[PDB]
Design a protein around this ligand. Structure first.
Ligand code: CLA
Ligand code: CLA
Ligand code: CLA
Ligand code: CLA
Ligand code: CLA
Ligand SMILES: CC(C)=CCC/C(C)=C/CC/C(C)=C\CC/C(C)=C/CC/C(C)=C/CC/C(C)=C\CC/C(C)=C\CC/C(C)=C/CC/C(C)=C/CC1=CC(=O)C(C)=C(C)C1=O
Ligand SMILES: CC(C)=CCC/C(C)=C\CC/C(C)=C/CC/C(C)=C/CC/C(C)=C/CC/C(C)=C/CC/C(C)=C/CC/C(C)=C/CC/C(C)=C/CC1=CC(=O)C(C)=C(C)C1=O
Ligand SMILES: CCCCCCCCCCCCCCCC(=O)OC[C@H](CO[C@@H]1O[C@H](CS(=O)(=O)O)[C@@H](O)[C@H](O)[C@H]1O)OC(=O)CCCCCCCCCCCCCCC
Ligand SMILES: CCCCCCCCCCCCCCCC(=O)OC[C@H](COP(=O)(O)OC[C@@H](O)CO)OC(=O)CCCCCCCCCCCCCCC
Ligand code: HEM
Ligand SMILES: CCCCCCCCCCCCO[C@@H]1O[C@H](CO)[C@@H](O[C@H]2O[C@H](CO)[C@@H](O)[C@H](O)[C@H]2O)[C@H](O)[C@H]1O
Ligand code: OEX
Ligand SMILES: [Ca+2]
Ligand SMILES: [Ca+2]
Ligand SMILES: [Cl-]
Ligand SMILES: [Cl-]
Ligand SMILES: [Fe+2]
Lengths: 243, 176, 119, 135, 95, 102, 36, 155, 334
């Protein structure tokens, strides 16, 4: 195909791949201290696949296994967002403010669990190294967002067991009722580590792309388990324009 | 009025999935095949005593020779189903037996429901419905549906106790 | 047969003309830059969208305006549609100067409708 | 009760007075309620905007208040939001928008006068009715 | 481990509306707050003060007149990452 | 405590199923002590009680009502539009008599 | 799996192929009476 | 969705009641589709929202600022005119009270042929028995004397 | 003689132990694949996500559940109505998590009984029987293809189908009573009239010939022995069984001739159940049973309760509780 022409962009999987620019790493668009016609499209087809596994046999049992995506091809997010700001010296801020984000992926590693991974972009506030004119297909964007939960205050288990409404702590064992331990269902506003690079950076349509490295928390299914750690690394697929 | 008493016995007792009711579904639906499959083969093996084109002309009631084959019908069902009624009696005794012992097993279930020995609960499959949100099954999906009965229709079914409910005590799943 | 459209034009027909005049000054936009540079199916966004509301809107010249000049005003409102059939169906042609002269026809009829019928 | 006259009294105008309504105009007001006031106002709930119920707990709170049926035939003449800020005659059947919503052509003012009288007689005779309806 | 939802319901969020993690149909209970007035309230200023609103950009002086009619019917609660999260303010679970 | 033991749902012979097999002490364990009788008061008094769970239920939703029958408190299943919850009403428990008196 | 898809697609066309010219070769002449 | 736009909450950020997007999640093959229970009809290609179909699917550049007042009021009419009937005239959800009547004659004609489509498979099968026994001569039953199964060998 | 005619001459032969003949050559492979996959996935399938959001429900015997639960659980709402073979998923673990193996034992099982339809016709032409027994097997095939296929078409996805297991079925039926109301629908009510009629007429016809049996044994042995199989003389007299039932009910309303009797034995459940099969097939397009909600009323307009809204107060509850996470918008019309 030459271009995609959306009716041929049906179930053939030429569809979950946003803007891939041409091989030209020599575009320096040279912004200054002002506002922007803030950036587009921004977002990622999240896969290489790398996951840290929980130790439980203490201080050893690090050293990542791989994983298999046991579900379909909607590890993606799309077009909005990314208020860009240039602060007082370097460090070249990046604000997301209202993008389409958080798809949810399920994987299984060797070990037969199904941890629910969360690729979240909730309020990245991205720092940056020392003094850049503009991105040169070399510079490193790295910070964290805040992640959301799995139970977004209504996801019941199969005995209707949530905090936010929904039948406190027991239904059917009426005399062993208030003894179980898994009914504290509290939400959190975390911060972690994430990195995102840049590699291609075209000049005319002015879309910049390059690698990412996201390190998240896993599911807490209204607080049963502790989180696992997942190194999700893929291309960013941004698009930039400005005032 | 029977249809209320049906959905009474779903919610307040779980009259499905106790085993004494489930033999009765094997009684009636097993009874409904054995009159359907026996109604077929006597109209599939017939014996050319008429010369007209409908079959039940010139069948005498005072006729000693038997109007269906049973030799071709046994040869039919030994091949298709693999098992076949190899004598013409106990084909009729089985058609007596299969819905009568269906209702008798169904009759001794509701006497357990009379003193409401329901067997709605499994002794297993509930403690890790309590401890474990990762344990996800149809039975615990089904047992919350019966809670959808017992707090929704019970103020309107029985106004004897004057049950009145303030509309956030009722189990609502979501936006519905 | 009613000459006096006191509230009949001033609430209805001067909002009938006002909504498609508002698409009209906008219309030198991304849509001309779609047929300038390189966006095939966002023209079919526009023809069934912002020009989908240029026509379903421009439909009740029957239901509000002057029934003697109604049958001559149907085909004025039909030629603006039927030229814009050539706009969305030259997107499968993949050659955007059959659609460009189709868009210049929408200068000849939309504002000619907007010059006409102040009644 | 027999549906007597003095339970069918309700204030028909702004804040000062009422009127008595006879029996047969309610039943064609019921008939036009099941024709045009119908697909988005079954049981008083509003299926497209789910918390704009026709309960008089909530019909009083939309300003200026929608209990006066001369105001309520004005609010089908000129529909609005709860504050009277913008018209929603894009999005609502009206007589201002009869060219948009074609069902409002075969109707009159007095054919709206009884369906305004119908719609608040229904919570006068039931509590659950013209309410959330979950219970 | 107070399950983080009913504890917020005790501190005046169950009593009155709160402008920080209040539902949109809580504003329906007062005459004159729904959609075109509570849109600027719930998106912009859940900050720290019962008197900081009436000074948000986006409303007129006629729009703040309805605010001063029922000004003493809310207290600002501290923010919540259980109840503001999820886009829960504009579309709740009750319909 | 013998009179208190006969006023228990868990000695009424309705509950128990067909295949929940064994003694009643496999259902509750051994009865240790009464720990009194609950008396529920609001911030105002307004005394209110629980007399609920009839026999052919399994999971009765908890309601708290006054002398004539108007509900004053419950357990809110959906805490978006609660108006009769425990926390806004501020119900206290007076546990009178028994093991855990006062 | 695309290696598997053809192997399943052979055996459907084998069995339905041996059904569609199964009946095509006399199938009203093995009806144990006249013209058997 | 667009009711929400008037309210102003940002569509993309919000996670439904269950982790997924309340409004705009992604289908298994990449098309940004409507969320909720609408994942079954992610192949919907009617005349409205074809001006919301972007390159991938429902594009969020044009899902905001390009909804038209004609566009929503068709879908407002099509929401309440869903195919949901009673037997008689009752419309909408079965649980819902019969305030208004509309059977939606898509549905009311779709089942009516399926009565007749299945019944014509009954009689076709039941004529194919008599037609195959017409040339074979035992449409009136098997013979007394030359029974063909007694000629067949034992099992 | 001929090599390909050596085939057609074994497959169509009538002296095999089981008849695999021309309908059987589509049936026997595509039923054994439906047998072997179902028996394997009854015990060892992973959890499968029926509702289509995230949470995977378990239906296999190594995951702690018993016989009376735990279907091979149907496909996901995400895949909808799309054809989902085993070769479209990127691995096998993607296939089993997304409700894979149900479409292996629906699309094989349904074509495995539609060729069991014609196989019963085929042997009746392979003998001299009058072939009218496949039309009796369209009565439970349409019972097994309305709910597996046809209800899974018009309702939407393949998630709304029968979960083929014993207490997966019971979760389906309460949803169908919830979602569109099975009981107040006359085509279901014509079905149980065939079934309860077929319940009685099995124990009516089967009783009375067992009653009117002639004496050929003595007391000590079984009375089911005194005749040989395939004899020409009857084991019972129809003339004594006629006027027993003629003296129990109307004498005019008995069945004098047995070939008219056995047709009505083969009529009443068979014509009954494909109304009930056509009930779910006309339920599939959301043409539902009627509501008498708010039907009778005072001259006020105050709502009088009937049995039908007591039905609906039970039917509101399962509708407001089934699929308890997916519904974000207040109508369950999908
Ligand atoms: C596949 C579906 C299926 C099947 C086949 C059955 C089968 C059966 N169910 Mg069942 N059931 C099912 C699903 C099913 N169930 C489901 C999903 C539910 C909801 C959970 C129930 C709930 C249910 C209940 C609540 C009960 C049954 C009962 C029964 C039994 C029927 C008893 C009967 O016919 O007596 C028929 C009635 C009589 C024989 C009484 C005598 C009446 C005489 C014979 C008739 C009088 C004639 C006279 C002239 C009047 C006629 C004229 C009139 C028109 C005016 C039978 C075993 C019953 C049972 O097992 O209890 C023992 C019962 O009480 N079912
Ligand atoms: C065609 C598919 C199918 C099959 C195979 C079954 C099978 C069964 N159903 Mg069922 N059911 C079906 C469709 C089906 N149903 C439908 C469409 C509905 C309505 C929605 C129901 C509603 C229903 C109810 C309400 C109940 C059952 C019950 C039962 C069980 C005993 C009934 C019985 O004796 O049947 C009579 C038929 C025969 C005796 C002929 C022999 C057929 C046997 C029973 C099949 C065994 C099934 C097994 C999986 C086969 C394994 C073979 C192996 C080689 C793979 C049995 C497991 C009852 C139950 O739970 O009992 C345990 C019960 O209460 N079903
Ligand atoms: C009617 C007489 C009677 C009574 C009421 C009871 C009642 C009880 N016994 Mg007891 N028991 C009995 C006879 C009886 N038993 C007999 C005859 C024996 C000797 C075998 C025992 C031996 C015994 C022991 C060893 C113990 C009890 C215990 C108990 C108590 C616990 C509850 C329980 O086990 O229920 C369970 C009941 C069931 C699971 C119901 C069974 C239903 C059957 C299986 C249905 C059969 C259907 C049939 C197969 C289908 C027919 C086929 C069809 C084709 C016709 C309970 C009070 C326990 C206790 O508390 O003692 C300290 C205990 O440890 N019992
Ligand atoms: C005769 C028996 C029979 C039948 C009817 C089928 C039929 C089917 N199998 Mg199947 N299968 C069989 C035997 C059979 N199989 C055997 C023996 C095995 C074990 C090796 C399997 C193993 C198997 C697997 C593992 C899978 C299937 C699948 C399928 C389905 C789709 C296959 C496809 O792409 O069709 C394409 C067919 C054609 C293009 C037909 C072309 C033939 C001619 C040219 C056209 C004329 C026919 C047409 C109808 C008109 C289909 C319903 C898939 C499935 O159900 O997904 C869940 C699947 O994943 N099969
Ligand atoms: C008191 C016992 C009793 C009686 C009289 C009935 C009677 C009936 N039930 Mg019912 N039912 C019963 C118990 C009973 N049931 C129980 C215990 C349950 C389980 C809880 C059910 C569950 C049940 C369901 C789920 C349904 C029925 C339905 C029906 C009706 C049709 C059934 C049918 O055709 O049977 C088959 C038998 C025959 C056709 C033989 C003929 C019997 C008829 C009824 C007698 C005719 C008498 C005649 C008209 C009187 C005049 C005399 C004449 C000589 C002039 C019928 C009125 C169905 C319905 O809706 O229909 C309205 C239906 O859906 N019943
Ligand atoms: C006060 C005092 C002292 C009074 C007593 C003295 C006195 C004055 C008496 C007079 C009063 C009086 C006589 C009557 C008044 C009471 C009265 C009216 C009672 C009627 C009540 C009533 C509703 C009766 C009708 C119900 C009834 C009995 C039957 C229902 C009949 C019906 C509609 C359907 C039956 C189903 C049916 C057709 C079954 C047959 C089908 C079938 C498969 C048969 C099987 C079969 C048939 C065969 O044919 C043979 C061969 C064999 C093999 C065989 O399998
Ligand atoms: C991994 C795997 C395999 C999992 C499978 C597990 C699973 C999901 C399901 C299986 C579980 C299961 C079987 C549950 C059912 C349990 C249950 C209820 C059992 C019944 C037990 C019980 C006490 C029931 C009480 C009622 C009772 C006795 C019912 C019996 C039912 C029964 C045997 C019905 C017979 C049905 C049948 C085959 C009828 C056809 C008869 C037949 C072959 C006629 C042929 C024939 C006809 C003629 O006309 C003539 C002339 C001749 C000559 C002739 O021959
Ligand atoms: C206004 C109401 C709605 C109108 C629309 C519907 C109209 C329906 C009209 C039907 C016309 C045909 C009826 C007879 C069919 C027939 O050939 O029977 C032939 C046999 C034999 O009759 C035999 O008939 C012989 C006479 S002769 O040979 O046919 O000439 C003779 O031997 C003797 O009389 C007898 O043994 O009739 C019977 O067996 C008696 C049973 C009653 C008639 C058959 C009904 C079939 C079962 C009921 C189905 C109900 C459906 C729902 C079930 C849950
Ligand atoms: C695809 C083609 C092949 C089909 C494969 C499946 C065929 C299975 C046939 C049933 C086997 C024989 C059973 C009766 C054993 C038997 O020998 O029957 C014999 C009996 C005939 O007996 P006779 O006429 O020989 O009796 C002579 C008298 O003297 C009596 O003693 O047939 C029947 O009664 C049929 C009715 C019961 C049939 C019950 C069917 C049960 C189905 C399976 C249910 C359990 C499954 C459990 C799964 C978890
Ligand atoms: C002629 C018939 C109708 C009448 C009399 C009518 C009446 C009303 C009234 C009186 C209100 C305001 C209620 C209040 O303030 O509490 C209202 C609101 C509303 N009606 Fe209707 N209505 C009609 C038809 C419809 C139809 C067909 C729809 C569906 C398209 C609809 C959708 C709405 C909506 C969406 C609102 C809420 C406006 C908002 O979102 O703010 N109405 N209607
Ligand atoms: C799409 C299918 C269409 C097929 C069209 C061509 C049909 C060809 C018929 C081949 C049938 C094989 O059947 C063969 O028929 C020949 C014809 O003389 C007989 O001789 C053989 O005994 C038989 O084996
Ligand atoms: O999910 Mn299965 O299901 Ca028979 O409905 Mn519609 O969607 Mn739900 O509903 Mn009520
Ligand atoms: Ca009108
Ligand atoms: Ca609150
Ligand atoms: Cl559910
Ligand atoms: Cl929804
Ligand atoms: Fe017989």
């Amino acid at each position: 195909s030459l271009l995609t022409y959306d009716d041929i962009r049906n179930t053939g999987l030429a569809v979950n791949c946003p803007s891939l620019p041409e091989t030209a790493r020599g575009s320096i668009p040279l912004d200054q201290n002002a506002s922007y016609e803030i950036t587009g499209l921004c977002l990622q087809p999240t896969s290489y696949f790398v996951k840290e596994e929980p130790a439980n046999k203490r201080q050893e049992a690090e050293f990542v296994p791989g994983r298999l995506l046991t579900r379909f091809t909607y590890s993606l997010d799309q077009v909005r967002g990314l208020l860009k700001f240039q602060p007082d010296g370097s460090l070249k801020f990046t604000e997301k403010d209202g993008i389409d984000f958080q798809p949810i992926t399920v994987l299984l590693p060797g070990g037969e669990q199904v941890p629910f991974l969360f690729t979240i972009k909730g309020l990245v506030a991205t720092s940056q190294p020392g003094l850049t004119s503009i991105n040169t297909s070399t510079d490193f964007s790295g910070d964290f967002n805040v992640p959301s939960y799995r139970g977004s205050t209504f996801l019941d288990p199969k005995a209707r067991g949530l905090a936010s409404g929904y039948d406190n702590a027991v239904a059917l064992p009426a005399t062993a009722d208030e003894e179980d331990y898994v009914n504290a269902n509290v939400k959190l506003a975390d911060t972690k580590f994430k990195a995102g690079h840049i590699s291609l950076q075209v000049a005319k349509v002015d879309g910049e792309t390059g690698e990412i490295a996201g390190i998240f928390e896993s599911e807490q299914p209204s607080d049963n388990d502790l989180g696992a750690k997942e190194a999700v690394e893929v291309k960013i697929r941004g698009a930039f324009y400005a005032r | 009025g029977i249809f209320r008493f049906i959905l009474f016995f779903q919610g307040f007792h779980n009259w499905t999935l106790n085993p004494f009711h489930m033999m009765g579904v094997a009684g009636i639906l097993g009874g409904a095949l054995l009159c359907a499959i026996h109604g077929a083969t006597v109209e599939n093996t017939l014996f050319e005593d008429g010369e007209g084109s409908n079959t039940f002309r010139a069948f005498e009631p005072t006729q000693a020779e038997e109007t269906y084959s049973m030799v071709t019908a046994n040869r039919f069902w030994s091949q298709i189903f693999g098992i076949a009624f190899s004598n013409k009696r106990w084909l009729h005794f089985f058609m007596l037996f299969v819905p009568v012992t269906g209702l008798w097993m169904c009759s001794i279930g509701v006497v357990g429901l009379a003193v409401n020995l329901r067997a709605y609960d499994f002794v297993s499959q509930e403690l890790r419905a309590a401890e474990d949100p990762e344990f996800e099954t149809f039975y615990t999906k089904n047992i919350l549906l019966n809670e959808g009965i017992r707090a929704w229709m019970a103020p309107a079914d029985q106004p004897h106790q004057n049950f009145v409910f303030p509309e956030e005590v009722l189990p609502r799943g979501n936006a519905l | 047969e009613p000459p006096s459209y006191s509230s009949i034009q001033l609430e209805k027909i001067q909002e009938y003309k006002s909504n498609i005049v508002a698409i009209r000054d906008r219309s030198t936009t991304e849509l001309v830059s779609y047929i300038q540079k390189g966006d095939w199916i966002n023209i079919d966004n526009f023809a069934h969208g912002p020009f989908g509301t240029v026509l379903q809107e421009m439909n009740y010249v029957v239901r509000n305006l002057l029934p003697n000049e109604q049958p001559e005003a149907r085909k004025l409102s039909r030629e603006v549609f039927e030229h814009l059939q050539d706009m969305s169906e030259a997107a499968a042609k993949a050659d955007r100067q059959q659609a460009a002269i189709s868009y210049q026809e929408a200068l000849k009829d939309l504002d000619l409708f907007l010059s006409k019928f102040p009644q | 009760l027999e549906l007597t006259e003095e339970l069918r009294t309700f204030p028909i105008n702004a804040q000062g007075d009422t009127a008595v309504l006879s029996l047969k105009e309610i039943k064609k007001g019921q008939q036009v309620f099941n024709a045009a006031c119908a697909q988005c106002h079954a049981l008083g709930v509003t299926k497209t905007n789910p918390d704009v119920n026709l309960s008089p707990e909530a019909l009083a709170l939309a300003t200026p208040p929608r209990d006066n049926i001369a105001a309520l035939v004005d609010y089908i003449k000129n529909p609005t939001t709860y504050d009277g800020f913008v018209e929603i005659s894009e999005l609502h059947p009206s007589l201002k928008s009869s060219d948009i919503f074609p069902k409002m052509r075969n109707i009159s003012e007095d054919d709206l006068y009884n369906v305004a009288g119908y719609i608040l007689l229904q919570p006068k005779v039931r509590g659950e009715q013209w309410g959330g309806g979950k219970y | 481990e107070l399950n983080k939802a009913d504890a917020k319901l005790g501190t005046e969020f169950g009593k009155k509306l709160d402008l920080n993690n209040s539902s949109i149909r809580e504003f329906r209970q007062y005459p004159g707050m729904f959609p075109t007035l509570a849109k600027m309230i719930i998106d912009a200023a859940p900050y720290d003060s019962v008197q900081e609103v009436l000074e948000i950009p986006g409303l007129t002086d006629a729009q703040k007149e309805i605010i001063e009619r029922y000004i003493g019917e809310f207290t600002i609660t501290p923010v919540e990452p259980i109840l503001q999260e999820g886009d829960f303010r504009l579309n709740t679970g009750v319909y | 405590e013998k009179l208190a033991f006969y006023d228990y749902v868990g000695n009424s012979p309705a509950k128990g199923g067909l295949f929940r097999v064994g003694p009643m002490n496999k259902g509750d364990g051994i009865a240790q002590g009464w720990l009194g009788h609950p008396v529920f008061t609001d911030a105002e008094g307004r005394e209110l009680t629980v007399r609920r769970l009839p026999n052919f239920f399994e999971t009765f939703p908890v309601i708290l009502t006054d002398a004539d029958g108007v509900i004053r408190a419950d357990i809110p299943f959906r805490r978006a539009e609660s108006r009769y919850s425990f926390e806004q009403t501020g119900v206290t428990v007076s546990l009178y008599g028994g093991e855990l008196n006062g | 799996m695309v290696t598997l898809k053809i192997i399943v697609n052979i055996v459907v066309l084998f069995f339905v192929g041996l059904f569609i010219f199964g009946f095509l070769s006399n199938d009203p002449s093995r009806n144990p009476k006249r013209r058997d | 969705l667009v009711r929400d736009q008037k309210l102003g909450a940002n569509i993309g950020s919000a996670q439904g009641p269950t982790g997924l997007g309340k409004y705009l999640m992604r289908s298994p093959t990449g098309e940004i589709i409507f969320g909720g229970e609408t994942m079954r009809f992610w192949d919907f290609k009617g005349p409205w929202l074809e001006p919301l179909r972007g390159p991938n699917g429902l594009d969020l550049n044009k899902l905001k600022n390009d909804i038209q007042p004609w566009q929503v009021r068709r879908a407002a009419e099509y929401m309440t005119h869903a195919p949901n009937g009673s037997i008689n005239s009752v419309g909408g959800i079965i649980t819902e009270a019969q305030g208004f009547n509309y059977v939606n004659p898509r549905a009311w004609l779709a089942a009516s042929h399926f009565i007749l489509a299945f019944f014509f498979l009954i009689g076709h099968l039941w004529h194919a028995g008599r037609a195959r026994a017409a040339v074979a001569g035992f449409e009136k039953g098997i013979d007394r004397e030359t029974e063909p199964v007694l000629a067949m060998p034992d099992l | 003689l001929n090599i390909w005619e050596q085939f057609c001459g074994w497959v169509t032969s009538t002296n095999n132990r089981l008849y695999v003949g021309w309908f059987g050559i589509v049936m026997i492979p595509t039923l054994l694949t439906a047998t072997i996959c179902f028996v394997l996935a009854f015990v060892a399938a992973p959890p499968v996500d029926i509702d289509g959001i995230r949470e995977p429900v378990s239906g296999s015997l190594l995951y702690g559940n018993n016989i009376i639960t735990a279907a091979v659980v149907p496909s996901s709402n995400a895949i909808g109505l799309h054809f989902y073979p085993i070769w479209e998923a990127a691995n096998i673990d993607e296939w089993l998590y997304n409700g894979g193996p149900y479409q292996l034992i629906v699309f094989h099982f349904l074509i495995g009984i539609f060729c069991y339809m014609g196989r019963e016709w085929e042997l009746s032409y392979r003998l001299g029987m009058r072939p009218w027994i496949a039309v009796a097997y369209s009565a439970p095939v349409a019972a097994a293809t309305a709910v597996l296929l046809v209800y899974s078409i018009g309702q939407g996805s393949f998630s709304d189908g029968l979960p083929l297991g014993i207490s997966g079925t019971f979760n389906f039926m309460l949803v169908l009573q919830a979602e569109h109301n099975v009981l107040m629908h006359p085509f279901h009510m014509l079905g149980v009239a065939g079934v309860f009629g077929g319940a009685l007429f099995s124990a009516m016809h089967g009783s009375l010939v067992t009653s009117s049996l002639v004496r050929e044994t003595t007391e000590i042995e079984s009375q089911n022995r005194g005749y040989r199989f395939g004899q020409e003389e009857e084991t019972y007299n129809i003339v004594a069984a006629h006027g027993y039932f003629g003296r129990l009910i109307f004498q005019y309303a008995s069945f004098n001739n047995s070939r008219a009797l056995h047709f009505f034995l083969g009529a009443w459940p068979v014509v009954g159940i494909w109304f009930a099969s056509l009930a779910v097939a006309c339920f599939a397009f959301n043409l539902n049973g009627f509501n008498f909600n708010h039907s009778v009323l005072d001259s006020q307009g105050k709502v009088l309760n009937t049995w039908a809204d007591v039905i609906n107060r039970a039917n509101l509850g399962i509708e407001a509780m089934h699929e308890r996470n997916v519904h974000n918008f207040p109508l369950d019309l999908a």
